[PDB]
Amino acid sequence: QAMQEFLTRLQVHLSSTCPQIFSELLLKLIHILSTERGAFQTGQGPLDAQVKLLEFT
Amino acid sequence: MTNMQLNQETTAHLLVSDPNLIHVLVKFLSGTSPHGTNQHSPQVGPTAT
Numbered sequence: 001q002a003m004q005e006f007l008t009r010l011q012v013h014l015s016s017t018c019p020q021i022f023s024e025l026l027l028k029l030i031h032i033l034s035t036e037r038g039a040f041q042t043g044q045g046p047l048d049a050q051v052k053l054l055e056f057t
Numbered sequence: 058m059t060n061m062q063l064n065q066e067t068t069a070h071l072l073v074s075d076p077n078l079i080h081v082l083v084k085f086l087s088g089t090s091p092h093g094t095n096q097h098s099p100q101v102g103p104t105a106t
Contacts, residue, residue: 041091042089042091043089043090043091043092043093
């Protein structure tokens with residue numbers, strides 16, 4: 001929930017100014033997690049936070 | 058293959074002198090369950106040990 005409110009407040013504060021930078025940051029997050037030696041491939045890390053981040057993206 | 062004779066250098070010397078064997082041992086000792094399809098123990102059981 002805390003990560004969801006943090007990402008939601010980033011979206012709200014940067015919707016008017018520059019949402020493309022926040023979208024590119026989210027895409028870079030998915031890219032770094034999804035590559036080799038990452039959290040997605042190795043299975044490490046929280047499943048709930050990654051699933052909620054995916055739903056937010 | 059450590060029991061196996063090659064026709065010189067023994068095959069155990071070939072295994073240890075090969076640089077790929079250390080990556081084989083790292084990949085075995087850091088394998089865990091990367092797929093994560095089902096809930097599984099991180100241990101490999103007695104037989105692999």
